[PDB]
Amino acid sequence: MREIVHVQGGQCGNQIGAKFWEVISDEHGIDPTGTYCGDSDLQLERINVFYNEATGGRFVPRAILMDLEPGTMDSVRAGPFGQLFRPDNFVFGQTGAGNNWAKGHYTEGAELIDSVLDVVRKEAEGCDCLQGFQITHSLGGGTGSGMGTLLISKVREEYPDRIMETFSVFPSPKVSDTVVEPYNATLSVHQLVENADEVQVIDNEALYDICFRTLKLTTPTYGDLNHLVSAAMSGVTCCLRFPGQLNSDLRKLAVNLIPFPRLHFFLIGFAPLTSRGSQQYRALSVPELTQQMFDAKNMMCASDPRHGRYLTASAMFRGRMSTKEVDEQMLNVQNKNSSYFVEWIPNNMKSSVCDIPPKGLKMSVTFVGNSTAIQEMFKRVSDQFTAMFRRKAFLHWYTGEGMDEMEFTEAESNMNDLVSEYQQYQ
Amino acid sequence: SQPVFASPLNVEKRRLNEERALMQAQKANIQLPPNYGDMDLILFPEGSLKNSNNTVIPQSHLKGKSVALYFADGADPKCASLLPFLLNYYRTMNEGGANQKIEIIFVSLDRDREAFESHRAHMPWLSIDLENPLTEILKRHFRVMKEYEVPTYGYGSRTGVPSVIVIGSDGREAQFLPICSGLEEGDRALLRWDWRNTKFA
Amino acid sequence: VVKRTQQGNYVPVRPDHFAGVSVALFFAKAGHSKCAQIVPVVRQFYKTTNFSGEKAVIEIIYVSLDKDEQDFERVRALMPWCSVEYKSCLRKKLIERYRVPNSTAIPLLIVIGPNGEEAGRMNFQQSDEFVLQRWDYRFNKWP
Amino acid sequence: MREVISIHVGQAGIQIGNACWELFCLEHGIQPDGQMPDAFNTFFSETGAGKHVPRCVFLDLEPTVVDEVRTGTYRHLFHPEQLISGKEDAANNFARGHYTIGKEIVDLSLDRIRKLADNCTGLQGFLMFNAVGGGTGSGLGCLLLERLSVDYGKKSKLNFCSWPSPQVSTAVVEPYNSVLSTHSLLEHTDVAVMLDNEAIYDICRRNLDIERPTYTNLNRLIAQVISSLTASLRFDGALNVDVTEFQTNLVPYPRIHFMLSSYAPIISAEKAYHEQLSVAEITNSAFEPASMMAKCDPRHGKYMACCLMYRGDVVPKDVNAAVATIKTKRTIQFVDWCPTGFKCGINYQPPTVVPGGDLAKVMRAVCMISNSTAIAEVFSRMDHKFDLMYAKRAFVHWYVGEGMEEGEFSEAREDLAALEKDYEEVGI
Amino acid sequence: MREVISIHVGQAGIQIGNACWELFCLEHGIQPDGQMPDAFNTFFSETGAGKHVPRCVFLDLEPTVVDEVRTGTYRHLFHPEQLISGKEDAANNFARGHYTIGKEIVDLSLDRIRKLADNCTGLQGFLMFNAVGGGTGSGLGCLLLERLSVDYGKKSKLNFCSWPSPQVSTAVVEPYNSVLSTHSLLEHTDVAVMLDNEAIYDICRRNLDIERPTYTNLNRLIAQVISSLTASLRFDGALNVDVTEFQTNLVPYPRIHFMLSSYAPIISAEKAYHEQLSVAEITNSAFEPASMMAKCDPRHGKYMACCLMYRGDVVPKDVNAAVATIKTKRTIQFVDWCPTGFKCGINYQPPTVVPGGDLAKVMRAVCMISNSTAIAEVFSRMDHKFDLMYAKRAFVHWYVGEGMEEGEFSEAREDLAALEKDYEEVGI
Amino acid sequence: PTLPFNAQSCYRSEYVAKPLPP
Amino acid sequence: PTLPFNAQSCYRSEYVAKPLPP
Ligand SMILES: Nc1nc2c(ncn2[C@@H]2O[C@H](COP(=O)(O)OP(=O)(O)OP(=O)(O)O)[C@@H](O)[C@H]2O)c(=O)[nH]1
Ligand SMILES: Nc1nc2c(ncn2[C@@H]2O[C@H](COP(=O)(O)OP(=O)(O)OP(=O)(O)O)[C@@H](O)[C@H]2O)c(=O)[nH]1
Ligand SMILES: Nc1nc2c(ncn2[C@@H]2O[C@H](COP(=O)(O)OP(=O)(O)O)[C@@H](O)[C@H]2O)c(=O)[nH]1
Ligand SMILES: [Mg+2]
Ligand SMILES: [Mg+2]
């Protein structure tokens, strides 16, 4: 069949994607020691999309972990579901990139990228025919943004037709540590636009905003933010692992959401999301779900979708439901919200049904949409970049490592063209 | 002497049938020792096979069907992977027709009774209890071994757990289904099970 | 194994009664809000369509997912149609044969043909409540 | 004997094929195993000890539907390599399923079609079910027509395409795949029957009164339609009409073979028993404009030809009487140059209802396949959708990169316009 | 009475013969002891009370495969000195096969061949099993053929060579070995049949769905082919075809006797349930290009002559109707100097299935041996590999050190080139 | 603290055995 | 310590006393 190779880099990319394997193994019923429990065939019939048989019956994830420091690798291994991963698939550094894209990409990340290219060649070539790659990382930091994007550039040269989708955590709107943030962000963005087929954006103040009104959590730790990300993360591959009335894999999604090649930045949302108190007082019907996922305060980017136009979008429904009432409602949203969409594309919206809803619910939907309202993000990073680049601030950590001044202008020329290209279509 | 000669079940077979031959010769130009075709055994006695919620099912209800032994373990991950495929196969195959065709008799290699009941709570087909010495004499007869610990009389380990062996009326193996075998086709060897020819007569 | 409630006690069912008519089993559970929703509606529907005529046209065999003899006898004390026996293996056989997960599944009516295999599936965990009469009791009558 | 071969391509092709091969199994009384406890020869073969295998091929480039048929209830009914599956889906791209990944499993498909057509002669024709708006239903279907017209040139080809609806489409790439496949099935498909999803949603919402239907509720209705078209081959009747019978009676011109469909009576459990299903009544309900199965209002069209397939306890006088009322009714307009445009094909066998379904046992039924000039609007909708998107080259680079040149988009545009002009000038 | 003597030299010959002899023991119903509980006479002798022993010789220069036959299940079936063993392996060297080691074991073989031949006159011929890729199968196999033809002159000498694959090798010096053998067996073997491991691998994959077959899966299918050739010698037939019929009907010129094979049906248990195995279908699949036994595409040649051995409940009617269909179909071409071109042989006995094997019980089967012009290619790809590496004298110091002179390498090369021209001149 | 599995495919739910007409 | 020998030849695996046909 097909297998999605999972490549995981940086502190954020490990920590939100280690608990990705919490959720996938829970749905597929994997004991943390690797055995299967759950006495049904629908899980296990298509399990090689994310696992490998290991001649003793245990299922190892086809996942690769990257970092330039051994701190978070110890923590991922030491938690629950830490023994699932193969110890060989770990690749360690000893120095660590101190929030510097230059030593993530050019200088220190070069001595490690040969080893991690070796492990990704072993477990992508050894299969029958892979579909694509799934890379999880951040942009504010050094090891996730820098050395992660180096791997994206390397694999896109090696495998030039497989799909390449990224669960990228963009910089923060308002509250931000890692003071040299837009330098790492802008450099990663102009390298993402040339090599990544799909990019799915995540903001932390988006996730904080979800769990303050909807989920009503008073004290949200980093674990429950990742549980919210990994919920919509595993929904993108519902069609691959489980059968359904209308299937839609990643290449389905790419041709259906991307009108023009340079603009492929998406917007992730998930529904339903209710507190534990009001869990049992709601009517879980497809009118309620569709209103939940077309709402500005349900997205995982804190950029207003009412301030732009949805170019194209897609909803991938999960659960036993009615194909008529999912078709009428998803046209019901277009009939009233016509001023929120674009006019030269008829029927912007995609339906797909998976017959296996996520665990402990009975009906779910994930929303991914190519919106031109994402230009408020790239303007925000660009004007922070412009303010810090006129004064030549913080450049000496980048020029010192062996990076030239010119590609800073090149990166700014790329995102201003990216902002302008989205502005034509509003 | 099928499929082995040094089996406890085959030894017991030869003793009873040749005792019958001697008594018949004493009562009455008869072949001593008797031919292997003419030797006969009763395989599952009256107290062996029990169905769901513990009701005795005799050997009479296995007639005209394809009967396979499922040598299985509880904590073996290969067994846990193979179980749902065989559940779906059994259910679909028995629904597909007026009469029911296949049956599975479960032979356990578990550690203890708690593991036995915990694993057998899933299964809808017939099962042989762990204390009954049939569950070890059939094991030695069809050459199943988790590890080389049994005194084994020049055998090779024919299979490792899990395995399914289609059995004949007189204990001969109708066909080996190759899950962990020379063909190594896991969870898809079940499709090779033919049921016209391997009828438990 | 299948009992009928009469004035005072219970009687085993006659196998000749199930012929000439149509048969559905009712998978349910005492103490469930939706089961208490649906039981009286099916009761009034049953009595109307079976006493509006000379010959009976349908019957229901009630199968329970209750964990208590007290609740089982409680619902059997007021439900008019047939019932199964609690300790008989046929109740668990029907469960594992018909895939009720033991919620959003109970109540359920599975209409069964003469050869023991289903002729219809009907649920109530939905907005519509006029679905009881969507089952034809004249195409599928047992011989 | 009199055999037809049904080809299922794409997810809509497979899932429609599940409903029709459930109904034909029940109708001839064969089990999911494959053996029953010679009228079934038109759809089933013979294999030794009474097993009858279907004369069908399952094609889809994506495993997740064909593989799940193999694991399902009908395991041993279908031959194991009569179900053909690829590795990666066409993924809503006509260029993928036609140039890059299509060609790998075409030769496997023709090999099984060759081996199934050479069993006996007297091959009556081919049937194909596919989704126009999908990837492999359009992609692999166009290749499979092209490489079947060259080999079996003489035989008829009846297509049942699941055309995208005007409102609901579940794709932005569907105007591209619609107009790119119309250039395929103009010159290869003999007679195409035009199916629409939310037309059947409207039928099953007000006739049979399901508020929330699904794909397994629409596919039963399609299965009853296909069973009515091929009822005449299977069973004896008063007026038998084959599949060669349809091309000579419905299409007057080589390029004009696009036609609607209708069924009557689509009736529920409660409604059926309380109602006289007169022979006059089911014909009148068939010609009702909203009761068509395409969402294409025929009042702004002209009926060129029309065939009525009766099924049940139908006497020929009531057929002659009822259709004379239809012709003298003023609402529906008939074309001046075609004075006679009606068919009576009367069959004895009643429609066999799937239990657990939604329809009732009815004593008689009528299925109408009508060629009308109302097809101009359903192409004008897809034409205007294609003009908006192609005005600024949206979703074009996906097609160009897989091998399709830029210019097949150009030429298929006037091909649809050439089709549109012909339907205008024939209505004069 | 009627006898055939089987010679199995080399590791491939012995392990082919083990599957070949368990089929004959099972089909005639003898135990591994050798006594059953008069069709056996061509294969099994008569000694003592009920014991039958095979008319076979097993040859190898290394002990590690004939000693392990002596220890396995079939000890007492074979005569003790029908299993001739050497001391040292020939080690992939043709020169070692002729001149160094083979000059001491050949005297033991001819003594056992002569003693087994002379017990009755009516010796139908010698079957020879060898691998032209190896040392003792090619080198010592040549020495037997030179010694057999000088004494047993006009007896028919069939051969079955496991010719090396175009891509699969397991031996790097096999370009040298099988070129030298070709110059040898050209002027001794009456009829040579090429068997190719890559050919049987693809047969086991697309028919039986065996993803990982081993060598013993291969030899079961080879055993069935040998059984089908000699089936008319053993059992009664409506139209007999013995060993002498093969050569007189397939070898139009004395140096043109390299020929192909195809066996049909090869069907597992899960697929025999759904196909009827009509005489038309089993002979259609025999001529399929992907159904061959030697991995050479038959479309780039013309069939010089053809022989079809039907085995089972084959009515003589349906042979003529089916072979008329093959002659009508034009993707298969015949050369102009052979207008009548087929051979038909029917035997009533259906094939015998080994328990615990891979095939299923079938009621009929076809074995087809074809002399084609397409054999020029399997020699030409062989021809090019030898020249590409002899020209720099690689791997020659092993050959010249063990006795043969370079100059035999050159002579064998031009003799192949003479054979290469012969296929070209005859294809006109 | 896991939960059991209670979902089946739509094909497995609507495409089962079916009683033949007499 | 030691590990027990477990292996048998492929000849002995699949060339055994097959049951004769009737
Ligand atoms: N009536 C009906 N239509 C269906 C069904 N399944 C899919 N469709 C139609 O199929 C269209 C989507 O294209 P698909 O058929 O899923 O795609 P495909 O033909 O399988 O080709 P791929 O995109 O490569 O998978 C939708 O617009 C539906 O109208 C079905 O079961 N019944
Ligand atoms: N068909 C078939 N071919 C075999 C088998 N075993 C070996 N071969 C062929 O034998 C070739 C290798 O030569 P061998 O037969 O092993 O060598 P040999 O003929 O015994 O002579 P030596 O090289 O001296 O051992 C391989 O290329 C195989 O094609 C078998 O079991 N079946
Ligand atoms: N949502 C989420 N965000 C994180 C997590 N870990 C780090 N981040 C974000 O990533 C940034 C820190 O960069 P980091 O990933 O540690 O740098 P790195 O060492 O190069 O990988 C901060 O802006 C955080 O908001 C996490 O577990 N969850
Ligand atoms: Mg498709
Ligand atoms: Mg050797």
TrEMBL record, chain A:
Residue numbers binding GDP 3: Q11, C12, G142, T143, G144, E181
Highest taxon in the source lineage: Eukaryota
One Gene Ontology cellular component: microtubule
Pfam family, one: Tubulin_C
Chain residues that bind GDP 2: Q11, C12, Q15, S138, G142, T143, G144, D177, N204, Y222, N226
InterPro entries (UniProt xref): Beta-tubulin_BS, Beta_tubulin, Tub_FtsZ_C, Tubulin, Tubulin/FtsZ-like_C, Tubulin/FtsZ_2-layer-sand-dom, Tubulin/FtsZ_GTPase_sf, Tubulin_C
Entry function: Tubulin is the major constituent of microtubules, a cylinder consisting of laterally associated linear protofilaments composed of alpha- and beta-tubulin heterodimers. Microtubules grow by the addition of GTP-tubulin dimers to the microtubule end, where a stabilizing cap forms. Below the cap, tubulin dimers are in GDP-bound state, owing to GTPase activity of alpha-tubulin.
Xref: PANTHER family: TUBULIN (PTHR11588)
The name this protein goes by in its record: Tubulin beta chain
Source taxonomy: Eukaryota, Sar, Alveolata, Apicomplexa, Conoidasida
UniProtKB/TrEMBL annotation, chain B:
Gene Ontology CC entries for this record: nucleus
GO terms (BP aspect): negative regulation of protein ubiquitination; negative regulation of Wnt signaling pathway
Every Thioredoxin-like fold domain range: 64-172
Matching InterPro entries: Thioredoxin-like_fold (IPR012336), Thioredoxin-like_sf (IPR036249)
Any GO molecular function: thioredoxin-disulfide reductase (NADPH) activity
Name of the featured protein: PDI family protein
From TrEMBL, chain C:
Source domain of life: Eukaryota
GO MF terms held by the record: thioredoxin-disulfide reductase (NADPH) activity
Alphabetical list of Pfam families matching this protein: Thioredoxin_8
Annotated ranges, domain Thioredoxin-like fold: 22-117
A GO-annotated cellular component: nucleus
Annotated InterPro entries: Thioredoxin-like_fold, Thioredoxin-like_sf
GO biological process, one term: negative regulation of protein ubiquitination
Protein's name in the database: PDI family protein
Automatic annotation (TrEMBL), chains F, G:
Name of the molecule in the record: Microtubule associated protein SPM1
Annotated family: Belongs to the FAM154 family.
Organism: Toxoplasma gondii
Classification of source organism: Eukaryota, Sar, Alveolata, Apicomplexa, Conoidasida
